[PDB]
Amino acid sequence: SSQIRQNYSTEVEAAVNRLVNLYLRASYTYLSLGFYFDRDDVALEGVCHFFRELAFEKFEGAERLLKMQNQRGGRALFQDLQKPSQDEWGTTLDAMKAAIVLEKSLNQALLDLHALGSAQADPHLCDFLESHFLDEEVKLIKKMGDHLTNIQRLVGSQAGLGEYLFERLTLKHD
Amino acid sequence: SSQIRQNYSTEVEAAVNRLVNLYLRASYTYLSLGFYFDRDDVALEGVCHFFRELAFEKFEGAERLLKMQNQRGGRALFQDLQKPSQDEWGTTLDAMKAAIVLEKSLNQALLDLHALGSAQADPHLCDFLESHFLDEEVKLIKKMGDHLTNIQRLVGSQAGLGEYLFERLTLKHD
Amino acid sequence: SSQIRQNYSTEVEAAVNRLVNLYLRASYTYLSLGFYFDRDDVALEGVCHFFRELAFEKFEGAERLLKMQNQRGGRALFQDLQKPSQDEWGTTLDAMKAAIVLEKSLNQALLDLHALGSAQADPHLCDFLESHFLDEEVKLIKKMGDHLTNIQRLVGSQAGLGEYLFERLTLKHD
Amino acid sequence: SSQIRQNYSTEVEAAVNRLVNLYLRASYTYLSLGFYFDRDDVALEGVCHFFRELAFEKFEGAERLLKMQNQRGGRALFQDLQKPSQDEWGTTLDAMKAAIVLEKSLNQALLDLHALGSAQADPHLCDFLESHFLDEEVKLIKKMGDHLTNIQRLVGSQAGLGEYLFERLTLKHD
Amino acid sequence: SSQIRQNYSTEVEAAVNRLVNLYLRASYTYLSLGFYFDRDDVALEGVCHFFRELAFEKFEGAERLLKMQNQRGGRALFQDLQKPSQDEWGTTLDAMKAAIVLEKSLNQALLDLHALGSAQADPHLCDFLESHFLDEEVKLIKKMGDHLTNIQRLVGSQAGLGEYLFERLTLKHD
Amino acid sequence: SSQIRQNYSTEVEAAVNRLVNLYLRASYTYLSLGFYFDRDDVALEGVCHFFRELAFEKFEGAERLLKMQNQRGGRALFQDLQKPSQDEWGTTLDAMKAAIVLEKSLNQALLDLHALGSAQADPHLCDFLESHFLDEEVKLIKKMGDHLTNIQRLVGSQAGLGEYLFERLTLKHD
Ligand SMILES: [Cl-]
Ligand SMILES: [Cl-]
Ligand SMILES: [Cl-]
Ligand SMILES: [Cl-]
Ligand SMILES: [Cl-]
Ligand SMILES: [Cl-]
């Protein structure tokens, strides 16, 4: 069949395609989050920029998976990409909570694929995830948790003031 | 009559002169807004600077219209310039609300002139407005709406604190 | 309702959201085309690079439309993104034919939206499309037609040789 | 028929070819004007240079139209180019009057083609003319009218002195 | 009342507002003069540039007065700005005569305000006018008188030739 | 009659005007050849560029002849410029064959004019042609013959492949 394929299971090939779908879904979710915060009636530039940057980061993860699929001799298969779970994302707090939920779901999918690779004795796959995905996800989730704690401490009894200050003094703007 | 005039209606010529009056009136309004915020009993430098910059921008729009009037062979006609609608402009919120009202009025005058040009089959006029006025106005109104949303979120129950923070962390000063 | 919206119809707002979907669908189609040509059993780097660049270009078009939607006071609404029409794209000729069909479809959607804007007397919309989309599309379709003619002249009776030479001597690589 | 042609009428295609003929005729007229002023018995270098520069400018307009014809999928068709209307061009005043008449005729042809494009719902054509021809023509006609006024004010009762001074102090020489 | 106001009479405050009106009226007069000389049927670039520069200079004088009003604790009050005294300004000579009349009127208003300040024992006001207005006005009136003498010497029996030569060899152009 | 004319026959003056017509006709032929090869259904950039460069070169020859006519005291006389002999130019081979035929015709006209100058004892004319035209034409015809031989050797039994390779590997592009 394939001239280069070696030690690459059909199970891993399919899970890789599924993970591409998840990362592209996540990228699309972040595009929607970013543009919501650019609305004139939301207007939080640093929050917009944060999520637009994450849309690109998730796309780059999908791109790396597609490069790897071909390096291994599998075949990329694309599926429909479902729209994000919400049209309007509420407050910065609500948005950051949704993002952490999204990231935990990508992380579990990475861990599930790592376990499949381990079970199939596919060390290239396992190394690929360890080298380019697992620590990146851990670092991002830590950042998001740090942000959640700071957003929550700023709510107090003046939510608008806190949401403005977080965007201006923590998030980068521009 | 004119050695260069071609496809330039008397209706457009007159509307151009009227629009110069509107832009100069707007420039004068912004001069008054700017100096109000420089009062020792208002003292919001970033707000002053914002409006003084807009006084210059509106003047430059009037200047471009006057250059174009001559390029087309029409004759600039100047009228009395009415004073701004207020002597004192209230809070930054009140001022930004007045500015958005002013900008919507200039925008409608641009759109009305574009429609006249379209009706008169004057594509140079229509292009001129599209290339140097329509998008500039859209961008400015979006900026002003973003500012309004941020000012409103900062009012809460501590209006002075919010007005200070907006001027310091959003408006340019320095 | 909206503090900035002016001369922006619900019909244009909805068509803009539909056009974002079309551009993102096109971007996804080009991602699939690009990775197909990176397969070890296809291996045409310049063709891969051509289509991956177009995936980014179509994404940037969607991004510009989303920025504009917000500048005008409309609300971005995202829908499901359908998968590309094919999983395997055949020869470079077949792929370039599919791309020209795709581009003609985006072009017609641009022209349809321009006509709606003209009918609604929305010159900002019309200018936006003229300034950032119509000529870009015309230039791209011309390029693709030039490529089709060169690919076709190279088929003769030695198709593989011609497909290699086109990728090496016309398309940028590496 | 054509693999790239879309929304491009036969009427516009033919009018574009006609406009190429007009621009090349105008270029040839300016070549003749330029060399007349280089005659030893006329010897007005700045006037020669002015018209030779315009010969190139009109050629570049024809070249842009030909590029566009191909970008749109139309076919350039060339016709005989008629010689200029005069062999000898009189005074600088006579020449500048002939040039303004020529430019008004090109301008009307641009406006006529714009109107045809508008009628045919061809916004690429209309934008192309607005972006690269309408304002260039308006600016040139204004310049020529400014020159005519200065030449006329210099005639008085010493025509030769005035013609020399205009060439030396207004026209560029080197 | 005011937290900073000291030794600043209501009479000076009001006269300062009146002088702002005069300077803005003068600025508007110079804008009209400048654009008249940019007409295709007048076409004297150096004269246009001279008056457009003076429009800016008079605006800057108004701006300095407004800054000072606030520095002293007075309140800027803006009034309607009357249109210039003429729609068409005749020859360069006629225009320069009107400008010298205008400048003498601003100068007398400066001297009147200086005398009021002296009478009110307001040395800051008097110094402000001496340091930023009195000598600037004297220098400008001298320049304008030098220009008038040169324009008059050039009229002789060839007015157009003289008006051209003055614009080309004295006034700055490009 | 002429203050500078010396040793310049009416026969040479007229032949110079005729040669200007021939060079401009040739320039127009090359403009048509160039744009034919820019058609989306021909698409040979290096061939387009080759002929567009020759259109400019032939124009420059006409310009040099016109400069010389005036240097000698003759009078440039322009005639109608006939359209090129074909609307469509076939293959690169067909086009290069037509160009060599065109160049041989210009060369014979140069040689005929040189012989007239020799007969009229006009050494300035003869030197002018020797210094700026005869060797330029010989070099160009040699280049074109070298191109013809290479195009012919590439036809074999795969004409499209050969036409592509010639354009990519010999003609400058990209
Ligand atoms: Cl499906
Ligand atoms: Cl009045
Ligand atoms: Cl759904
Ligand atoms: Cl014919
Ligand atoms: Cl009033
Ligand atoms: Cl004839």
Side-chain angles (χ1 to χ4, degrees), chain A residues 2-157 159-171 173, chain B residues 2-157 159-171 173, chain C residues 2-157 159-171 173, chain D residues 2-157 159-171 173, chain E residues 2-157 159-171 173, chain F residues 2-157 159-171 173:
Chain A
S2 170
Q3 66 191 351
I4 70 171
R5 196 176 182 148
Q6 187 175 29
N7 201 35
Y8 196 58
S9 69
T10 59
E11 290 88 2
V12 163
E13 175 185 16
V16 166
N17 282 329
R18 283 197 299 271
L19 190 58
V20 167
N21 196 87
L22 286 177
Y23 269 75
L24 292 176
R25 275 172 59 187
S27 183
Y28 199 19
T29 295
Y30 286 128
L31 179 70
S32 175
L33 272 158
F35 275 97
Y36 166 79
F37 283 101
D38 176 58
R39 285 171 44 165
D40 72 271
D41 58 358
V42 176
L44 290 166
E45 182 180 330
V47 188
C48 168
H49 287 183
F50 178 78
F51 289 128
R52 284 187 59 214
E53 287 159 13
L54 280 170
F56 177 62
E57 290 177 14
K58 291 309 155 191
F59 171 69
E60 294 288 293
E63 199 180 65
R64 191 185 289 276
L65 282 158
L66 291 167
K67 290 181 172 179
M68 182 274 288
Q69 179 80 287
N70 274 350
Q71 288 273 310
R72 290 297 301 274
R75 287 306 169 242
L77 280 182
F78 294 99
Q79 297 306 333
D80 293 334
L81 282 170
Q82 68 195 81
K83 70 179 195 186
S85 68
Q86 300 172 216
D87 297 323
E88 297 186 311
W89 297 98
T91 62
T92 302
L93 181 53
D94 292 322
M96 194 69 65
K97 284 175 182 165
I100 202 151
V101 167
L102 176 54
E103 288 309 321
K104 277 163 175 191
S105 81
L106 293 179
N107 200 37
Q108 190 59 58
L110 292 172
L111 294 172
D112 289 348
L113 181 52
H114 191 284
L116 171 61
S118 185
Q120 297 270 352
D122 192 338
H124 183 275
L125 180 282
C126 288
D127 168 83
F128 167 85
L129 289 179
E130 287 159 15
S131 299
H132 301 295
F133 288 83
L134 300 188
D135 188 54
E136 296 300 301
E137 192 59 36
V138 157
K139 282 183 303 168
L140 177 58
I141 294 168
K142 172 61 162 70
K143 176 58 66 178
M144 284 181 176
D146 291 349
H147 289 346
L148 277 173
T149 293
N150 278 282
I151 293 162
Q152 287 158 339
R153 80 166 27 104
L154 279 173
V155 172
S157 65
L161 168 65
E163 188 167 20
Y164 176 78
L165 287 171
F166 182 76
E167 181 270 335
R168 288 286 93 182
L169 302 182
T170 294
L171 304 175
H173 50 79
Chain B
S2 170
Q3 66 191 351
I4 70 171
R5 196 176 182 148
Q6 187 175 29
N7 201 35
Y8 196 58
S9 69
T10 59
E11 290 88 2
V12 163
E13 175 185 16
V16 166
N17 282 329
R18 283 197 299 271
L19 190 58
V20 167
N21 196 87
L22 286 177
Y23 269 75
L24 292 176
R25 275 172 59 187
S27 183
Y28 199 19
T29 295
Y30 286 128
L31 179 70
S32 175
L33 272 158
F35 275 97
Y36 166 79
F37 283 101
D38 176 58
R39 285 171 44 165
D40 72 271
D41 58 358
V42 176
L44 290 166
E45 182 180 330
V47 188
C48 168
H49 287 183
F50 178 78
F51 289 128
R52 284 187 59 214
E53 287 159 13
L54 280 170
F56 177 62
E57 290 177 14
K58 291 309 155 191
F59 171 69
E60 294 288 293
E63 199 180 65
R64 191 185 289 276
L65 282 158
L66 291 167
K67 290 181 172 179
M68 182 274 288
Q69 179 80 287
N70 274 350
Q71 288 273 310
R72 290 297 301 274
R75 287 306 169 242
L77 280 182
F78 294 99
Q79 297 306 333
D80 293 334
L81 282 170
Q82 68 195 81
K83 70 179 195 186
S85 69
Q86 300 172 216
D87 297 323
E88 297 186 311
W89 297 98
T91 62
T92 302
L93 181 53
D94 292 322
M96 194 69 65
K97 284 175 182 165
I100 202 151
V101 167
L102 176 54
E103 288 309 321
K104 277 163 175 191
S105 81
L106 293 179
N107 200 37
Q108 190 59 58
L110 292 172
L111 294 172
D112 289 348
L113 181 52
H114 191 284
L116 171 61
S118 185
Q120 297 270 352
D122 192 338
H124 183 275
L125 180 282
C126 288
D127 168 83
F128 167 85
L129 289 179
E130 287 159 15
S131 299
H132 301 295
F133 288 83
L134 300 188
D135 188 54
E136 296 300 301
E137 192 59 36
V138 157
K139 282 183 303 168
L140 177 58
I141 294 168
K142 172 61 162 70
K143 176 58 66 178
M144 284 181 176
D146 291 349
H147 289 346
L148 277 173
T149 293
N150 278 282
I151 293 162
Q152 287 158 339
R153 80 166 27 104
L154 279 173
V155 172
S157 65
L161 168 65
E163 188 167 20
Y164 176 78
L165 287 171
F166 182 76
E167 181 270 335
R168 288 286 93 182
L169 302 182
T170 294
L171 304 175
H173 50 79
Chain C
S2 170
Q3 66 191 351
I4 70 171
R5 196 176 182 148
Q6 187 175 29
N7 201 35
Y8 196 58
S9 69
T10 59
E11 290 88 2
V12 163
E13 175 185 16
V16 166
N17 282 329
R18 283 197 299 271
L19 190 58
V20 167
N21 196 87
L22 286 177
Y23 269 75
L24 292 176
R25 275 172 59 187
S27 183
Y28 199 19
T29 295
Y30 286 128
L31 179 70
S32 175
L33 272 158
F35 275 97
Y36 166 79
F37 283 101
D38 176 58
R39 285 171 44 165
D40 72 271
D41 58 358
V42 176
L44 290 166
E45 182 180 330
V47 188
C48 168
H49 287 183
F50 178 78
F51 289 128
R52 284 187 59 214
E53 287 159 13
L54 280 170
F56 177 62
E57 290 177 14
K58 291 309 155 191
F59 171 69
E60 294 288 293
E63 199 180 65
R64 191 185 289 276
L65 282 158
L66 291 167
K67 290 181 172 179
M68 182 274 288
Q69 179 80 287
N70 274 350
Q71 288 273 310
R72 290 297 301 274
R75 287 306 169 242
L77 280 182
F78 294 99
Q79 297 306 333
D80 293 334
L81 282 170
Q82 68 195 81
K83 70 179 195 186
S85 68
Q86 300 172 216
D87 297 323
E88 297 186 311
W89 297 98
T91 62
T92 302
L93 181 53
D94 292 322
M96 194 69 65
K97 284 175 182 165
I100 202 151
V101 167
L102 176 54
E103 288 309 321
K104 277 163 175 191
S105 81
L106 293 179
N107 200 37
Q108 190 59 58
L110 292 172
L111 294 172
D112 289 348
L113 181 52
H114 191 284
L116 171 61
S118 185
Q120 297 270 352
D122 192 338
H124 183 275
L125 180 282
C126 288
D127 168 83
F128 167 85
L129 289 179
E130 287 159 15
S131 299
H132 301 295
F133 288 83
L134 300 188
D135 188 54
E136 296 300 301
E137 192 59 36
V138 157
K139 282 183 303 168
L140 177 58
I141 294 168
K142 172 61 162 70
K143 176 58 66 178
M144 284 181 176
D146 291 349
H147 289 346
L148 277 173
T149 293
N150 278 282
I151 293 162
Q152 287 158 339
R153 80 166 27 104
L154 279 173
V155 172
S157 65
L161 168 65
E163 188 167 20
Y164 176 78
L165 287 171
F166 182 76
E167 181 270 335
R168 288 286 93 182
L169 302 182
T170 294
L171 304 175
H173 50 79
Chain D
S2 170
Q3 66 191 351
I4 70 171
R5 196 176 182 148
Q6 187 175 29
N7 201 35
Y8 196 58
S9 69
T10 59
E11 290 88 2
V12 163
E13 175 185 16
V16 166
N17 282 329
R18 283 197 299 271
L19 190 58
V20 167
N21 196 87
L22 286 177
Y23 269 75
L24 292 176
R25 275 172 59 187
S27 183
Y28 199 19
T29 295
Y30 286 128
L31 179 70
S32 175
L33 272 158
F35 275 97
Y36 166 79
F37 283 101
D38 176 58
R39 285 171 44 165
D40 72 271
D41 58 358
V42 176
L44 290 166
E45 182 180 330
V47 188
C48 168
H49 287 183
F50 178 78
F51 289 128
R52 284 187 59 214
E53 287 159 13
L54 280 170
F56 177 62
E57 290 177 14
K58 291 309 155 191
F59 171 69
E60 294 288 293
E63 199 180 65
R64 191 185 289 276
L65 282 158
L66 291 167
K67 290 181 172 179
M68 182 274 288
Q69 179 80 287
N70 274 350
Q71 288 273 310
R72 290 297 301 274
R75 287 306 169 242
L77 280 182
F78 294 99
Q79 297 306 333
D80 293 334
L81 282 170
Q82 68 195 81
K83 70 179 195 186
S85 68
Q86 300 172 216
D87 297 323
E88 297 186 311
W89 297 98
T91 62
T92 302
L93 181 53
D94 292 322
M96 194 69 65
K97 284 175 182 165
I100 202 151
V101 167
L102 176 54
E103 288 309 321
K104 277 163 175 191
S105 81
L106 293 179
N107 200 37
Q108 190 59 58
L110 292 172
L111 294 172
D112 289 348
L113 181 52
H114 191 284
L116 171 61
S118 185
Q120 297 270 352
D122 192 338
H124 183 275
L125 180 282
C126 288
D127 168 83
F128 167 85
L129 289 179
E130 287 159 15
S131 299
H132 301 295
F133 288 83
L134 300 188
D135 188 54
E136 296 300 301
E137 192 59 36
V138 157
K139 282 183 303 168
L140 177 58
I141 294 168
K142 172 61 162 70
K143 176 58 66 178
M144 284 181 176
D146 291 349
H147 289 346
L148 277 173
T149 293
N150 278 282
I151 293 162
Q152 287 158 339
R153 80 166 27 104
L154 279 173
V155 172
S157 65
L161 168 65
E163 188 167 20
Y164 176 78
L165 287 171
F166 182 76
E167 181 270 335
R168 288 286 93 182
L169 302 182
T170 294
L171 304 175
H173 50 79
Chain E
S2 170
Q3 66 191 351
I4 70 171
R5 196 176 182 148
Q6 187 175 29
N7 201 35
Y8 196 58
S9 69
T10 59
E11 290 88 2
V12 163
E13 175 185 16
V16 166
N17 282 329
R18 283 197 299 271
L19 190 58
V20 167
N21 196 87
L22 286 177
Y23 269 75
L24 292 176
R25 275 172 59 187
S27 183
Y28 199 19
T29 295
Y30 286 128
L31 179 70
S32 175
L33 272 158
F35 275 97
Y36 166 79
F37 283 101
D38 176 58
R39 285 171 44 165
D40 72 271
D41 58 358
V42 176
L44 290 166
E45 182 180 330
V47 188
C48 168
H49 287 183
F50 178 78
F51 289 128
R52 284 187 59 214
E53 287 159 13
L54 280 170
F56 177 62
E57 290 177 14
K58 291 309 155 191
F59 171 69
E60 294 288 293
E63 199 180 65
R64 191 185 289 276
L65 282 158
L66 291 167
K67 290 181 172 179
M68 182 274 288
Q69 179 80 287
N70 274 350
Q71 288 273 310
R72 290 297 301 274
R75 287 306 169 242
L77 280 182
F78 294 99
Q79 297 306 333
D80 293 334
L81 282 170
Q82 68 195 81
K83 70 179 195 186
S85 68
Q86 300 172 216
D87 297 323
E88 297 186 311
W89 297 98
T91 62
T92 302
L93 181 53
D94 292 322
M96 194 69 65
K97 284 175 182 165
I100 202 151
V101 167
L102 176 54
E103 288 309 321
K104 277 163 175 191
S105 81
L106 293 179
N107 200 37
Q108 190 59 58
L110 292 172
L111 294 172
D112 289 348
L113 181 52
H114 191 284
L116 171 61
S118 185
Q120 297 270 352
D122 192 338
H124 183 275
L125 180 282
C126 288
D127 168 83
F128 167 85
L129 289 179
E130 287 159 15
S131 299
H132 301 295
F133 288 83
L134 300 188
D135 188 54
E136 296 300 301
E137 192 59 36
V138 157
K139 282 183 303 168
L140 177 58
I141 294 168
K142 172 61 162 70
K143 176 58 66 178
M144 284 181 176
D146 291 349
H147 289 346
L148 277 173
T149 293
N150 278 282
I151 293 162
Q152 287 158 339
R153 80 166 27 104
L154 279 173
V155 172
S157 65
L161 168 65
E163 188 167 20
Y164 176 78
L165 287 171
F166 182 76
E167 181 270 335
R168 288 286 93 182
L169 302 182
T170 294
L171 304 175
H173 50 79
Chain F
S2 170
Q3 66 191 351
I4 70 171
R5 196 176 182 148
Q6 187 175 29
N7 201 35
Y8 196 58
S9 69
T10 59
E11 290 88 2
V12 163
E13 175 185 16
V16 166
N17 282 329
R18 283 197 299 271
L19 190 58
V20 167
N21 196 87
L22 286 177
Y23 269 75
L24 292 176
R25 275 172 59 187
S27 183
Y28 199 19
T29 295
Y30 286 128
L31 179 70
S32 175
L33 272 158
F35 275 97
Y36 166 79
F37 283 101
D38 176 58
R39 285 171 44 165
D40 72 271
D41 58 358
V42 176
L44 290 166
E45 182 180 330
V47 188
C48 168
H49 287 183
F50 178 78
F51 289 128
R52 284 187 59 214
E53 287 159 13
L54 280 170
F56 177 62
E57 290 177 14
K58 291 309 155 191
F59 171 69
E60 294 288 293
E63 199 180 65
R64 191 185 289 276
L65 282 158
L66 291 167
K67 290 181 172 179
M68 182 274 288
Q69 179 80 287
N70 274 350
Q71 288 273 310
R72 290 297 301 274
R75 287 306 169 242
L77 280 182
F78 294 99
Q79 297 306 333
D80 293 334
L81 282 170
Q82 68 195 81
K83 70 179 195 186
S85 69
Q86 300 172 216
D87 297 323
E88 297 186 311
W89 297 98
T91 62
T92 302
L93 181 53
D94 292 322
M96 194 69 65
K97 284 175 182 165
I100 202 151
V101 167
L102 176 54
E103 288 309 321
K104 277 163 175 191
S105 81
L106 293 179
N107 200 37
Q108 190 59 58
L110 292 172
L111 294 172
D112 289 348
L113 181 52
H114 191 284
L116 171 61
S118 185
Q120 297 270 352
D122 192 338
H124 183 275
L125 180 282
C126 288
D127 168 83
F128 167 85
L129 289 179
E130 287 159 15
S131 299
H132 301 295
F133 288 83
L134 300 188
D135 188 54
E136 296 300 301
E137 192 59 36
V138 157
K139 282 183 303 168
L140 177 58
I141 294 168
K142 172 61 162 70
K143 176 58 66 178
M144 284 181 176
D146 291 349
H147 289 346
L148 277 173
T149 293
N150 278 282
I151 293 162
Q152 287 158 339
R153 80 166 27 104
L154 279 173
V155 172
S157 65
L161 168 65
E163 188 167 20
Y164 176 78
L165 287 171
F166 182 76
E167 181 270 335
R168 288 286 93 182
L169 302 182
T170 294
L171 304 175
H173 50 79

